[PDB]
Amino acid sequence: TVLPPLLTDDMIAAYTAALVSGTATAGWTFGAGAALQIPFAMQMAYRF
């Protein structure tokens, strides 16, 4: 037999979309801790 995994595909999708939206409105702050509201070109200016 085979068993389906616990963490389903749409969960696997919805954990992945929040990796994008939080990177697209909070950027470095999305991972650094509490995610902080900021423009995306400012985030690029931080990265660059």
Binding site: A34, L36, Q37, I38
Partner: protein, 48 residues
């Protein structure tokens, strides 16, 4: 949004570094030190 006040915190993590190193004598395992067992054991060579 920029942080004004903050905190610090200690977290712990735990990860093994060694193992219970063992050893198995064959004679007191596969034989129990009967004379019969040691002599059929020569038919398997130095497998132990």
């Amino acid at each position: 949004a920029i942080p004004t006040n903050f905190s610090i915190s200690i977290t712990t993590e735990v990860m093994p570094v060694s193992m219970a190193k063992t050893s198995v004598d064959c004679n007191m395992y596969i034989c129990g030190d009967s004379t019969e067992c040691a002599n059929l054991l020569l038919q398997y060579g130095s497998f132990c």
